[PDB]
């Protein structure tokens, strides 16, 4: 529980910064691609676009790994949760 | 070579000698679905029968590739209907999509 949410919270925050910068790189890179106004800023934005894509991909992979672990915990909570039902059934 | 050039070179290496594929750009070269399907076939030939594909079946070729890629973890950035009525495919979407396919197979 403890390790997971700490890490998910941090990643989810970093994902918010990525998506925020990327919306702006996109707006801009699209404007340059459509107008042809500056093939050099264009290429530099493309690079940045792709760096941002790389970051997001690495976060998504880290998130999914953590989510697996969180599912395995949850299942274990449910295992222990069933043990409680057995106990309470014996408290007569 | 810059990021576009290197991506384009990768696309041509991977699809080399696939019948009906001719890559010269990130727009009209992708419309008919073959190029995408050839990329899929090259990595995962168990997921698609390339020899039976029909070059004129724009919707179906694109669908097979998008479904093949989605089935191994690559998010859909294109729908088959984005190719309909002779639309030129959006350059930045096609590039990002190919970028994600290459990144998937490079262990990202």
Numbering used by the authors:
A (entry chain A): 1071 to 1162
B (entry chain B): 443 to 550
Q: What is written in the article reporting this PDB entry?
A:
EHBP1 was originally identified as an Eps15-homology domain-containing protein 1/2 (EHD1/2) interacting partner that plays a central role in GLUT4 transport and couples endocytic vesicles to the actin cytoskeleton. EHBP1 consists of an N-terminal C2 domain, a central CH, a C-terminal bMERB domain, and a CaaX box at the C-terminus that is a substrate for FTase4. In our previous work, we showed that EHBP1 is an effector molecule for Rab8 family members, including Rab10, and forms complexes with 1:1 stoichiometry.
Since we had noted earlier that helices 1 and 2 of the bMERB domain are sufficient to form a complex with the CH domain, we then used the bMERBH1-2:CH complex and obtained crystals (SG: P 21) diffracting to 2.2 Å. The asymmetric unit contained two copies of the CH:bMERBH1-2 complex, sharing the same overall architecture. The interface of the bMERBH1-2:CH complex shows both hydrophobic and hydrophilic interactions with a buried surface area of 593 Å2. Most of the interactions with the CH domain lie on α-helix 2, with some additional interacting residues provided by α-helix 1. An array of hydrophobic residues including L1099, M1103 of α-helix 1 and M1116, W1119, F1120 and V1123 from α-helix 2 forms a contiguous hydrophobic patch on the bMERB surface with extensive contacts to L534, M537, and Y541 of the C-terminal helix of the CH domain. The Y541CH side chain also forms a hydrogen bond with the backbone carbonyl of F1120, and the R1131 side chain forms another hydrogen bond with the carbonyl of G549CH. Beginning with the C-terminal interacting residues of the CH domain, we could show that mutation of the conserved D532 to alanine leads to a more than 40-fold reduction in binding affinity, while mutation of L534 and T538 completely abolishes the interaction with the bMERB domain. The side chain of L534CH inserts itself into the pocket created by L1099, R1100, M1103, and M1116 of the bMERB domain.
